[PDB]
Design a protein around this ligand. Structure first.
Ligand SMILES: [Fe+3]
Ligand SMILES: [Fe+3]
Lengths: 150, 150
């Protein structure tokens, strides 16, 4: 698979995930419960506390972001590996550029509690569904998502 | 793990792989036989034909490169997924910028024949050895490699 201009300026390609953060799917494996994507926050953003059962890798393209549970913040060019089992809250700061991050995500995400409990999930089927749905609405066609399968 | 400025200009961090192509290790898993790295070619470059038993993901940072066995060439911003089992020859063109590519590699690589045979291998132990060795020589210390383990 070859996707030119992955972190495109074309807003249509980005699927809302939370209210402030969206992603462009690049590669999805329903069988492996795994996906690559560009994570985008045009403004201040937050992704709720969750943990992955497995690793996460990120390479930062632009903006400034990090997780509240570590001391670093990542800007253009910085690499991040999250250790499996880590509960974390992603945040994005307002920077000259939107936040854009290349991610390889081995799902599910388990949403965590204010407390510390499992309170919801996000797996690859949830991801395929939201992306198909958005791509139908914006006129990229639901079937463009199917093009990303492997 | 957080590595600032992964695709650094500091040449010392890059470990020669072929004569024209080098990589900076970013994350290495001896147990999973898997690693992330920045692949760099300052000039024209070539990596000999080989196949991975598993997937490869790449996000292109700068330069222009591709595989002889596909029709695309990848420049700044382009994403690539190589399907597992694919035999391929990586090439890098001379561009305004060096080639720099963020890779997640599930090894081993099996070197292939002019013909089409398995004729050599490259696994994570080979990678750890070459990186330790180079990092000792350049004065980043062999032990900096151990810092990359997970
Ligand atoms: Fe996460
Ligand atoms: Fe390869």
């Amino acid at each position: 698979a070859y996707i030119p201009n992955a972190a495109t300026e074309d807003e249509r390609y980005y699927v809302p995930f939370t209210e402030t953060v969206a992603s462009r799917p690049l590669w999805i494996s329903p069988q492996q419960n795994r996906w690559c994507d560009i994570l985008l926050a045009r403004e201040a953003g937050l992704v709720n506390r969750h943990y992955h059962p497995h690793e996460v890798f990120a390479y930062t393209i632009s903006g400034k972001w990090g997780y509240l549970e570590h001391d670093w913040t990542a800007t253009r060019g910085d690499f991040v590996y999250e250790t499996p089992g880590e509960g974390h809250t992603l945040v994005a700061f307002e920077h000259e550029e939107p936040m854009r991050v290349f991610f390889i995500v081995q799902g599910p995400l388990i949403w965590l509690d204010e407390a510390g409990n499992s309170i919801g999930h996000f797996d690859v089927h949830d991801y395929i569904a939201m992306c198909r749905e958005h791509y139908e609405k914006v006129g990229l066609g639901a079937d463009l998502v199917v093009t990303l399968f492997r």
